[PDB]
Design a protein around this ligand. Sequence first.
Ligand SMILES: *[C@@H]1O[C@H](CO)[C@@H](O[C@@H]2O[C@H](CO)[C@@H](O[C@@H]3O[C@H](CO)[C@@H](O)[C@H](O)[C@@H]3O)[C@H](O)[C@H]2NC(C)=O)[C@H](O)[C@H]1NC(C)=O
Ligand SMILES: *[C@@H]1O[C@H](CO)[C@@H](O[C@@H]2O[C@H](CO)[C@@H](O[C@@H]3O[C@H](CO)[C@@H](O)[C@H](O)[C@@H]3O)[C@H](O)[C@H]2NC(C)=O)[C@H](O)[C@H]1NC(C)=O
Ligand SMILES: *[C@@H]1O[C@H](CO)[C@@H](O[C@@H]2O[C@H](CO)[C@@H](O)[C@H](O)[C@H]2NC(C)=O)[C@H](O)[C@H]1NC(C)=O
Ligand SMILES: *[C@@H]1O[C@H](CO)[C@@H](O[C@@H]2O[C@H](CO)[C@@H](O)[C@H](O)[C@H]2NC(C)=O)[C@H](O)[C@H]1NC(C)=O
Ligand SMILES: *[C@@H]1O[C@H](CO)[C@@H](O[C@@H]2O[C@H](CO)[C@@H](O)[C@H](O)[C@H]2NC(C)=O)[C@H](O)[C@H]1NC(C)=O
Ligand SMILES: *[C@@H]1O[C@H](CO)[C@@H](O[C@@H]2O[C@H](CO)[C@@H](O)[C@H](O)[C@H]2NC(C)=O)[C@H](O)[C@H]1NC(C)=O
Ligand SMILES: *[C@@H]1O[C@H](CO)[C@@H](O[C@@H]2O[C@H](CO)[C@@H](O)[C@H](O)[C@H]2NC(C)=O)[C@H](O)[C@H]1NC(C)=O
Ligand SMILES: *[C@@H]1O[C@H](CO)[C@@H](O)[C@H](O)[C@H]1NC(C)=O
Ligand SMILES: *[C@@H]1O[C@H](CO)[C@@H](O)[C@H](O)[C@H]1NC(C)=O
Ligand SMILES: [Zn+2]
Lengths: 900, 901
Amino acid sequence: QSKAWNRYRLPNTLKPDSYRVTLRPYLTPNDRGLYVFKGSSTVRFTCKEATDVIIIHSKKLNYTLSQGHRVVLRGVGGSQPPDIDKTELVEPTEYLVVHLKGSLVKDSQYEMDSEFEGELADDLAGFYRSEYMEGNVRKVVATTQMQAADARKSFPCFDEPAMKAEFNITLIHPKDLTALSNMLPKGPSTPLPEDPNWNVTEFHTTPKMSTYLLAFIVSEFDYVEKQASNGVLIRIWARPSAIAAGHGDYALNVTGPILNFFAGHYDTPYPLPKSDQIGLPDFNAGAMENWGLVTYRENSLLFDPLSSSSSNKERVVTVIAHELAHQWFGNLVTIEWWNDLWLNEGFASYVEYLGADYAEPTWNLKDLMVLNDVYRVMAVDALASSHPLSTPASEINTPAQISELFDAISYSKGASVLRMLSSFLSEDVFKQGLASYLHTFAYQNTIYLNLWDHLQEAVNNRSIQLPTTVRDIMNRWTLQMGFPVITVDTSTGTLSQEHFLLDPDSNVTRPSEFNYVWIVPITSIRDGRQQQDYWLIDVRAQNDLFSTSGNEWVLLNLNVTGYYRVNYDEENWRKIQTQLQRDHSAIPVINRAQIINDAFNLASAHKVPVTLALNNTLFLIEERQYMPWEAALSSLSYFKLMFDRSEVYGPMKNYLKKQVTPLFIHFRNNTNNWREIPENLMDQYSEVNAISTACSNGVPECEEMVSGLFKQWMENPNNNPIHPNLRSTVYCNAIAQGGEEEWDFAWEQFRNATLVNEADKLRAALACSKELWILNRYLSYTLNPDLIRKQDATSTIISITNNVIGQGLVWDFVQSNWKKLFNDYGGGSFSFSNLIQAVTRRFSTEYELQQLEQFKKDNEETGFGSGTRALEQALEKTKANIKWVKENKEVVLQWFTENS
Amino acid sequence: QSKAWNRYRLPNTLKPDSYRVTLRPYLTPNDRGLYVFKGSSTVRFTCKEATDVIIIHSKKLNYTLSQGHRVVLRGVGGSQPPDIDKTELVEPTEYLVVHLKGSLVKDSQYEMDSEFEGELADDLAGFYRSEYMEGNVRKVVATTQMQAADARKSFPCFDEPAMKAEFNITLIHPKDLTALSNMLPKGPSTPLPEDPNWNVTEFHTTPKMSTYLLAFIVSEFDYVEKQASNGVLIRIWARPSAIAAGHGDYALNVTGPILNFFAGHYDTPYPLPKSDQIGLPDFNAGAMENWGLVTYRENSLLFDPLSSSSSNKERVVTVIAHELAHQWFGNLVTIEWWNDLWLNEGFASYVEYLGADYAEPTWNLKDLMVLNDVYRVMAVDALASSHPLSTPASEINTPAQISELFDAISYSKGASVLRMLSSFLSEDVFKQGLASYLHTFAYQNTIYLNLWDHLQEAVNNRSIQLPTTVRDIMNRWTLQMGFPVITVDTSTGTLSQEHFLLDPDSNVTRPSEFNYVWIVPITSIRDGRQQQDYWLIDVRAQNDLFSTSGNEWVLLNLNVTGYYRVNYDEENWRKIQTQLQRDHSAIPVINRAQIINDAFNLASAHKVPVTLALNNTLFLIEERQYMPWEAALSSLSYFKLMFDRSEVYGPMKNYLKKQVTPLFIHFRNNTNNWREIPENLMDQYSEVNAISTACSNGVPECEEMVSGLFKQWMENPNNNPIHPNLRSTVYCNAIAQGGEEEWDFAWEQFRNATLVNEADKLRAALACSKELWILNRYLSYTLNPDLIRKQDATSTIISITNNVIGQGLVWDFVQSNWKKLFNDYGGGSFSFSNLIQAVTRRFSTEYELQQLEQFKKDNEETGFGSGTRALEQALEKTKANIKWVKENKEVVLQWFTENSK
Ligand SMILES: *[C@@H]1O[C@H](CO)[C@@H](O[C@@H]2O[C@H](CO)[C@@H](O[C@@H]3O[C@H](CO)[C@@H](O)[C@H](O)[C@@H]3O)[C@H](O)[C@H]2NC(C)=O)[C@H](O)[C@H]1NC(C)=O
Ligand SMILES: *[C@@H]1O[C@H](CO)[C@@H](O[C@@H]2O[C@H](CO)[C@@H](O[C@@H]3O[C@H](CO)[C@@H](O)[C@H](O)[C@@H]3O)[C@H](O)[C@H]2NC(C)=O)[C@H](O)[C@H]1NC(C)=O
Ligand SMILES: *[C@@H]1O[C@H](CO)[C@@H](O[C@@H]2O[C@H](CO)[C@@H](O)[C@H](O)[C@H]2NC(C)=O)[C@H](O)[C@H]1NC(C)=O
Ligand SMILES: *[C@@H]1O[C@H](CO)[C@@H](O[C@@H]2O[C@H](CO)[C@@H](O)[C@H](O)[C@H]2NC(C)=O)[C@H](O)[C@H]1NC(C)=O
Ligand SMILES: *[C@@H]1O[C@H](CO)[C@@H](O[C@@H]2O[C@H](CO)[C@@H](O)[C@H](O)[C@H]2NC(C)=O)[C@H](O)[C@H]1NC(C)=O
Ligand SMILES: *[C@@H]1O[C@H](CO)[C@@H](O[C@@H]2O[C@H](CO)[C@@H](O)[C@H](O)[C@H]2NC(C)=O)[C@H](O)[C@H]1NC(C)=O
Ligand SMILES: *[C@@H]1O[C@H](CO)[C@@H](O[C@@H]2O[C@H](CO)[C@@H](O)[C@H](O)[C@H]2NC(C)=O)[C@H](O)[C@H]1NC(C)=O
Ligand SMILES: *[C@@H]1O[C@H](CO)[C@@H](O)[C@H](O)[C@H]1NC(C)=O
Ligand SMILES: *[C@@H]1O[C@H](CO)[C@@H](O)[C@H](O)[C@H]1NC(C)=O
Ligand SMILES: [Zn+2]
């Protein structure tokens, strides 16, 4: 608006060099019960272009006028300090405009001192407080989450990733509590000269960081430390009680290997002197890559071996790797602007599994990436509402736009694209370019093009053959949204590409350059033996590689490395099916899951018949791996949700029971009569799946075993015999196969629950009851805050909705008590979006659509709030559901009956 | 409108004298694939008042134009027939108005020849069709059902009960099949001149009768015959296989004696040479009393001693008695209008027990009547939405209202009134008066006043002492709806009477000439010793007969003879509970059941504490008789319907489980490990009650036994180990405690079932499944006429709505397919009301009432027809339920919890 303070982007008039921030957090409420902190900061900025105004980001800061102005300007090195005209604080653009009576000459450093007072509120932003209940005592900790902005809230600073500067952090903390920051403590905490109750801790100057990664936490958390033989001191800080137990031991045992792996992959030594990972009890954000002081949710860093499932073990190892990867890529080489967030977060997501694999080589974690990210993001990208990975930097300005960029696409899509990048570049050449990128751009900001250039330079040195320059071959997958579905005409060995859209009748309004065409790297296998390689340059191309003979099957996207679905002629599909039946080993496990997942998704776009998809699920009877089974069960979930209350459910269960029985018996023998869990994490997951589906479909042995296990627990409570991994499954099936007695025992345990994980497991299991009265009684308990915590109420109601009988109960509940639910819980505590999505997920009939539409008009006056933008979405999904059921019910029903 | 055709009442200007109907039923689909019957008819009518328009009933009949008109007017006796102006067909009133260019000469007989064609569909109305399967060949049987406004569908006629006439019936039927009509065939079947393959059979002229008593059935059914002592030839006609298997043996064993008994009791001879009882595969009503050709559902007539249960045996004898009773009260003497429908249904329902008791003297079915009718109607009669036994004629005009009157009030309330009337007038005096009524108005239509006059004659003849005239005393029980509740102050022995209302806040909009007061006849017993009787003529009275001293307890309405509820003070109730726990035998078995039923209903009306009624159910643990247990289970059903989907259900089940366990074991030992059955009929019913109640509540052995028995039947499909009487409960409980396999086995057996009784049991049991998907599939099956016969469609839906899981499914189904159910399915008006009551018997929340009100607002255009009153009553009950549950949920839960332990 012709005024720099009106503009959302900092003027490039001055750039910071060094910072000195001394903040004293008062973790005790003052007058009006306000937790406030007092801070003093100074910035030695350098005048890049002669100007008359200084603009510094500042949010929720009272400031103190040391002289006639809130700030004091002093020129350094004999620099003349221009007199300050006036001080103004702009809110729309968190800016501290300090108009000066004169112009600051260029090539001269000026320091601006600033004493300020802020509120240590529980906003989970900037400098915030977190109160946890240690025993029966409230304990408050002062932590920091300066993602995107928020850094301004803590102290006056150039809050932009481009503005890199050294930061000297000093914390005045109570003598009892300990203070932590990005760097090591410069000196041991000394009693503050005044009020000896408080100590003063100074930390060594931080390597030129870009803000947003600064962190200063003062608390009483204890810690387990280990000096790695590479020079980095690994310290895992957490609640003293948990550190006293072995909860934090696993993280310390896994951090060292992960750091070493990344050091090699990044070909760079750990930039900071030490690595502290702290487990905050709350911390709604999953994790933060604060340089040196990584903050994690207590549940994602601590692993109790007696009450955490192997799934939690995967969670901690993987999340640790993601943030530890950020320490090299994203902290040493930060993005110039938030528009390139996809490159930073995406790379971290991709190399996350790479690191975890080094730590646990017997888990094959890298394989899970596809099901966890590639297929997850593929579903969203296959909509006409998708956005291109790259966005014009000018477009992103407001803080809200920055937060918007943090989409699942930015993470998974980026990781998938970068995985394809590494595959067609050969990990070795990719790593070479990455190493050069980091070294050449160490301690400075960059654009995604810089990485493309270094990769191309490595391409030339290694002389790898790429159809076009890395930039062009990557622009196709970064400047336009969506992914190509490659159809293979084996008869004439022809290859074709198209923008895959799950809804066939979708108007792709977004005008994408390259007219939605992609340079797809194609890797193929023939009769098991991998062929050479091919790059689809145009929409349609012919190559003998894809040509097949009388009994020849070709399968593209080996290990689904490339972000593209594949469609084949019906003949090739049948050849693949015959191979899967005689020996599934020929097809790599990853591609077996690909076959099932792609078939179902292609059937949704009406590119292949639904029967073909179910045909690709027939070989599961012999499959003993996890990925293939998981893919099929995930896809068949929609079928169950649509036919759970219909006749089709009968034949469907019979078919699934026939397929699961062998897998269940296999595990029963392997686990020695359900006594010893399998070793490989993948096998552990499949064992849980086997029992769950076997009992759900009605395998007799499964229900007998789960019932017996729960009964053994009922006989001897306090010593649960069910192993943590199999607890949720046994609990739900046992309660379902049992009556009021079992539910009563479970309810008692839930009320006496001591660990949140166990409590939530019991809560969901209690909703597995098959008695209408018990479910209604549970619904009444859900609303009561005393019985069910309001934070957990929405999830409990959703869990009852999942019960086939519960669907009707919850639907009447939401339709009749929307007013109460919305009015009493208008706050974010109740996610109405998730609630309405869950209650309307099975809607597949015109009657149900009429009810939902009536609900919309009936409660129109009381805005659905978070529900809005999801209720209209549910209406659209309901309409699509009606069409799908009326177009596939007969075919699906016949298939199950004849194939069961 | 003023237009006579627009009016729903036939003009009195024309009176029918005699008719000649010649229906020809085509038992093969036409080019349009629709079975169609073609017939011609001529009505001889005397012109009571000169008229220029002739109005007759015509329904779904395409009349062939003759002489440029649908009808042809011919002069009888030389009278001139005025020229026909025009013939319009008014559909709303089903009136074929034959406008004339002149006024019919007054007091002149005329004849109207009319040819017509109609659809022989499966609507179970007029001339419909019944398709049964023999071997692998479909067999079609054309039968007639004209209970109300359906004779018009078969032929143009004055379809009103008052318009009696003699009907000459000629049936052109295939030479192979046999034509059955009200009277005997007049001579041998003669070959149709056009086609020898068809036969022309005319029957003897029928005596003066109403159009709704006609029956024309052509069938290949065989029959078993046996002349009765009165000489009337009793023949049981049914499917060839059924008669060959001796399913009709029991029917022939009871029909003859029962018919003679009725004739001897009222000294009135049956005026027809034969009385054929025929069982039709497809029939809506349980049975129709068509004079000479009484029609019955196969379930109500066929009886296989090796597969039918003791209850089935009672059903057959009772139904046959009810229909034979009608042959006197309904056919020989008919009602003037449907307003006094009770005069026929009520008497036939009450005297049915007398006939059954005669045929089966070791059953004591008259004891059951107390719970079968008196208490059954008291529930609906209590609602402020009931109707006086003799509703003003003006209210009942449209055919929908006519069919609506066929409810508990016309049947049970009438029978209960007759029970009380006979009790205070003595059987001898009562039957003497009835004989005069029958002989005086034979072949004539009568009203309630006519009955009172003949009864008064017997009263004076036998010098019976009454407070006032029979008319005044019984007008209180017939001209005002509802029944009185007597408050007994044992402290001072004072009595009072007031209209019993389930909702104390319910607004009665129906005015009463007697201002809701009754000359209640009262009979009281003291410590089991009967005392002198008293008549509560005034609203309030006092007597020492009711005043108690020390620990003396007084029970009014000994053997629930009177039609009223007894409300004792807390003192008497305490003494009664003391007696029940000390020696329940002291209190009459019937009165023990009376105590449980009265206590609960009084509590539901917010007149006594709910705890009091529940307390009265603590003697059940030691009770071994059937009647007490029966009333308790029936009364606690309301609690279940109101708390089955609530937290109270758990404690309630535990309590009942505790009470039934002893009875269950007792019967186990008595039945020798469930191998034998009790000898006494009542004991057999209680044994089945024990097993069903135990399995439903959760007694472990019960669930194990029923499952094992069904498993053994699955092993040997042909040999069913379960004893016929125990099949009902075992089948249901097994299917419920079983899964898809059990449901599949039952479905296959149901489709392959032979005896209707067994098929009915399996059909109802299939609804006991606890799988939502199975119940949804079952509901779709109900609509399919091929899988479930249209006659049993609503019954199956009601069974599904009975299942707790099915309640929601059916409610949404009813809301979604009201238009289809109301239109495609006629339901014969006997249903719909039942379906509405069944789907709305669990409503206890404002949201549920809102849904019901929305249903009415969204389906007012579609119409509720017969269900109109039922839907309106539902609204009243739902509102009362909302208040009752809110005021009693906690106390009911606490009581069960404390007693369950
Ligand atoms: C944050 O801490 C760093 C040190 O870790 C501070 O940088 C230091 O700045 C002072 C001037 O303020 C430098 O002193 C100068 O030393 C040179 C000789 O090296 C001398 O010729 C000059 O006359 C002057 O005394 C000091 O060297 C420098 N230290 C380093 C290692 O660069 C920084 O100023 C602190 N932050 C802020 C905002 O003050
Ligand atoms: C906050 O500052 C206080 C004061 O410095 C710390 O308390 C401890 O103070 C004593 C000196 O008064 C020191 O430790 C003590 O010294 C003896 C030897 O004389 C030694 O055996 C013990 O360590 C003893 O406690 C030390 O300065 C200081 N800290 C320690 C390690 O004891 C207090 O610990 C400070 N709090 C934090 C969290 O840094
Ligand atoms: C900084 O100044 C703001 C604006 O004056 C203060 O905000 C006020 O304080 C109350 C709470 O005590 C807030 O609810 C209102 O937004 C403001 N009201 C008033 C009366 O001014 C803010 O409190 C100050 N900072 C701190 C840490 O206290
Ligand atoms: C974490 O490391 C500790 C050792 O610091 C483990 O304790 C033992 O050490 C070995 C090697 O790590 C483990 O394999 C053994 O299971 C432990 N005991 C023995 C006798 O060697 C500890 O198990 C590791 N994991 C956790 C979760 O604490
Ligand atoms: C029905 O049958 C009767 C008897 O055959 C037909 O004859 C009339 O009815 C009386 C009955 O006793 C006969 O005696 C008379 O000869 C007839 N009466 C008149 C007034 O004609 C009778 O016509 C037939 N019904 C019809 C056509 O109305
Ligand atoms: C109907 O009557 C028949 C014939 O009386 C009954 O069959 C039995 O016939 C044998 C013939 O020797 C007699 O010894 C029995 O006394 C008859 N039993 C009875 C109960 O009468 C038949 O049981 C009767 N009832 C049924 C159900 O058909
Ligand atoms: C119903 O419950 C009992 C009979 O089962 C009646 O008597 C009570 O019994 C309890 C338990 O022994 C005592 O604690 C109470 O004091 C008794 N009642 C009184 C009023 O003393 C009870 O009165 C009945 N409740 C009714 C009829 O409402
Ligand atoms: C709660 O659990 C603890 C630990 O198993 C047990 O000692 C205690 O008795 C339980 N309390 C109740 C009330 O069940
Ligand atoms: C049909 O008529 C013939 C005489 O033509 C007769 O023998 C036969 O029994 C009749 N059939 C029936 C069942 O009416
Ligand atoms: Zn991250």
